[PDB]
Structures are given as C-alpha cells and as structure tokens.
Amino acid sequence: FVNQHLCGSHLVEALYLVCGERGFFYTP
Amino acid sequence: FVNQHLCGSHLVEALYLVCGERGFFYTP
Amino acid sequence: FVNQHLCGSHLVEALYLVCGERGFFYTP
Amino acid sequence: FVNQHLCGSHLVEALYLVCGERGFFYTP
Amino acid sequence: FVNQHLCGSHLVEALYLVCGERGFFYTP
Amino acid sequence: FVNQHLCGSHLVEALYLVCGERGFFYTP
Amino acid sequence: GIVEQCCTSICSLYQLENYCN
Amino acid sequence: GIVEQCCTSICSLYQLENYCN
Amino acid sequence: GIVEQCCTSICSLYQLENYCN
Amino acid sequence: GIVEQCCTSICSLYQLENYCN
Amino acid sequence: GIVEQCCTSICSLYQLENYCN
Amino acid sequence: GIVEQCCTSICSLYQLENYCN
Ligand SMILES: Oc1cccc(O)c1
Ligand SMILES: Oc1cccc(O)c1
Ligand SMILES: Oc1cccc(O)c1
Ligand SMILES: Oc1cccc(O)c1
Ligand SMILES: Oc1cccc(O)c1
Ligand SMILES: Oc1cccc(O)c1
Ligand SMILES: [Cl-]
Ligand SMILES: [Cl-]
Ligand SMILES: [Zn+2]
Ligand SMILES: [Zn+2]
C-alpha cells in the first residue's frame, strides 16, 4: 500500500547512512 | 569522497524504485 | 492533507527517474 | 553527466515545494 | 510513530530550502 | 555554489537521522 | 490525475511513465 | 512546535519560514 | 523483516544496523 | 533552461518559481 | 561495481536493474 | 562549520553527532 512503499524509501536511505562502506541487502 | 557518498544516496533510491519487491543489494 | 503532500514529493522523484531526458509536467 | 542528473533530482524537489498546487514543468 | 518520524524528514528538507543561508534549529 | 547547496541537503537528512529527539542545528 | 491514482495504490514504473512528456 | 503544527496540516513556505534563524 | 519491523515502530540507528552486511 | 540556470548557480526560491505552471 | 559504473556515467533504469536481487 | 568539515571529507555518524542539540 502506498504508506509501506513510501516508508521503504526512507528505510533504504537510513540503511545507506548507517551501514556505510559495509553496504546492505534490502529485501521488503 | 563526498561526491561518491552523495551519488550512492541517489543510487540507493533509484534501485529501490526499479527493483520493487525484488529488493536490491548495495555494495560501495 | 499532510499525507498527500508527502506522497507527491515521492511521486515527483519517481517521475524524474522514469521520465529521464523526456521530462514531465506535474499537476496535483 | 551524473552531476546534472543528481542536480535535477534536487531541482525537482525544490520545484515541488515552491510551486504548491500550481505544479511545475521539468524539462532537462 | 513512524508517520511523524517520516514527516520530520520532509520537514527538515523544506526548512533547508526556505531558510537558505540563514539556517535553522530543528527541535521535534 | 551548487555543490555546497546540494551537499547541505544531504547533511540535513543525515543530522535528522543521527540526532533523533535531540534535533540539530544547521548553519551554512 | 496522478495523486488520486498513485497515492491510493502503488503505481509501478510503467503506470508512472504515462505522466511523462 | 514544528511537528505538531506541520505534520497535522500542510505548512506553506511562509509558515515554515517562522522556524528559520 | 525490515518493513514489518521498522514501518510499525521507529527503528533506531542501532536497530537498523542489524540489516547491514 | 532550468538546468543551465540552476545547476551552475544557486537559484533562489523566487527564481525557481519561474518554472511553476 | 555500481559506484564505478553509475557514478561516472548516467545508468539507465535497465542498467540499474542488474543490481536487483 | 559543518559545511567546511563535512562537504570536503566524508563525516561519520559520530562526527555528525557534534551538530546535534
Ligand atoms: O504510487 C507511488 C507513489 C509515490 C511514489 C511511487 O514510486 C509510487
Ligand atoms: O506541512 C509540511 C510537512 C512536511 C513538509 C512540508 O513542506 C510541509
Ligand atoms: O523506523 C524507521 C522507518 C524509516 C526510516 C527510519 O530511519 C526509521
Ligand atoms: O540551484 C538549485 C539547484 C537545485 C536545487 C535548488 O533548489 C536550487
Ligand atoms: O547513474 C546514476 C546515479 C545515481 C542515480 C541514478 O539513478 C543513476
Ligand atoms: O560528509 C557528509 C556529507 C553529507 C552527508 C553525510 O552524511 C556525510
Ligand atoms: Cl513520507
Ligand atoms: Cl547530490
Ligand atoms: Zn516520505
Ligand atoms: Zn544529491
């Protein structure tokens, strides 16, 4: 639903910042 | 170093949109 | 309402990415 | 080419905020 | 709650743009 | 001048995430 | 148009592309 | 302050500007 | 996983860090 | 265009308003 | 990697799709 | 300031925390 899709996008930005040069897999 | 860092941020958002339910992997 | 305003902002980023060198008109 | 592309992304968000209900046009 | 956290993040971007070289304090 | 401006935008989002309930100050 | 359509259901990139020029 | 005000109604750029330094 | 966890409560940076590689 | 004007100098909000509909 | 390919040239959506799971 | 320190080198989250209230 739209709210979950929009939250994800914020979630990936937060992961980008936290994970740094480690990276991440994103699976929703 | 700031440019690659800021580029990655954009990259992550684009991968989020293009990958949908598959998710993606981000390796810096 | 706030939720629609916030959704729009995501919507324009998604259009930017999809439309590429074609561009878009955004009308809410 | 990446710099204009990443600039456009910011441009689009700013136009969204400044234009409100009028919307805007984005031509790259 | 998640919705308020997400709204904040949009709020700081809008303040960045409006306030310009003046800056701002953000207190939630 | 555009580069510092676009960097600030990213900076603001990162400060939002790292500071949580404390908030932050942004001085350009 | 776009807001009523894409803020009520997730629009795919194919749906969004209809709004391009 | 800002969250109670601007996450319950759309704040215009003029409303937001009150929070500038 | 991440969406059910972090879209229902605010995940801190410490919670998010669990999803890093 | 907006990219020539506003990716080479910082455009004000007033200047950006020239690209509203 | 994606940073070498896509921070030095503009990657299309098709190209970005190579980094989906 | 933050722009001098953090737009010329990548600031860690620890370093960014120096600009919290
Ligand atoms: O339905 C939507 C709403 C906002 C962004 C997006 O990619 C899709
Ligand atoms: O009321 C709001 C909330 C968030 C961003 C914005 O521009 C306005
Ligand atoms: O719980 C969340 C959801 C999205 C972004 C974030 O930093 C935390
Ligand atoms: O000149 C610019 C470029 C990008 C965003 C901003 O709003 C101003
Ligand atoms: O080549 C790129 C770099 C960053 C975002 C974009 O999606 C494409
Ligand atoms: O050094 C920086 C610059 C911008 C965002 C980031 O969080 C770190
Ligand atoms: Cl949102
Ligand atoms: Cl950028
Ligand atoms: Zn959002
Ligand atoms: Zn950027």
What three-state secondary structure class fits C25? strand
CA separation for the pair E16, E14 (Å, rounded): 5
User: Rounded distance, CA B20 to CA A8, Å?
Assistant: 10
> Percent helix, strand and coil across chain G, each rounded to 5?
55, 5, 40
Burial class from Cβ neighbours inside 10 Å (0-12, 13-18, 19+) for residue B18 reads buried
Longest CA pairwise span in chain G (Å): 23
Domain holding C15, by residue range, is 1-28
What determination technique applies here? X-ray
Q: What is the Cα–Cα distance from B19 to C17, expressed in whole angstroms?
A: 13
Nearest to E25 by CA among H2, H9, C6: H2
Which residues, numbered 1 to 28 in chain E, qualify as contacts with chain A under a Cβ-Cβ cut-off of 8 Å? 2-3, 6, 9
Number of domains present in the structure of chain F:
1
Whole-angstrom distance, CA of residue F24 vs CA of residue E25: 6
Return the amino acid letter for D28.
P
**Rounded to an integer, what distance in angstroms lies between the CA atom of residue C18 and that of residue B26?**
20
Across the strands, what pairs with B25?
A: A25
Taking an 8 Å cut-off on Cβ atoms, the answer to whether J7 and F1 are in contact is no
Q: Determine the distance separating the centroid of ligand 5 and the alpha carbon of B18, expressed in angstroms.
A: 11
CB contacts < 8 Å between E and F, how many? 39
Amino acid at H2: I
- CA separation, residue C17 to residues C25, F20, I17 (Å): 14, 30, 28
Containing E26, the helix (H) or strand (E) segment is: strand E24-26
Mutate to test the interface with A, among C2, C9, C10 (most CBs of A within 10 A): C10
Which DSSP state fits G1?
-
Q: Please indicate whether, in this complex, the C-beta atoms of H12 and D20 are within 8 angstroms of each other.
A: yes
Using alpha carbons, select from F18, H10, F15 the residue that is nearest to residue E24.
Answer: F15
CA angle E1, H1, A4 (to 5 degrees): 25
The finding on whether D9 has its CB within 6 A of some atom of ligand 5 is no
Q: Is C7 in the pocket of ligand 1 (CB under 6 A)?
A: yes
Amino acid symbol at D9: S
Asked if residue K16 lies in contact with residue K7, where contact means CB atoms within 8 angstroms, the answer is no
Whether K19 contacts chain B with CB within 8 A: yes
Resolution to 1 decimal, in Å?
1.6
Q: Which tokens hold the place of K7?
A: 């921070």
The DSSP code for L11 is: P
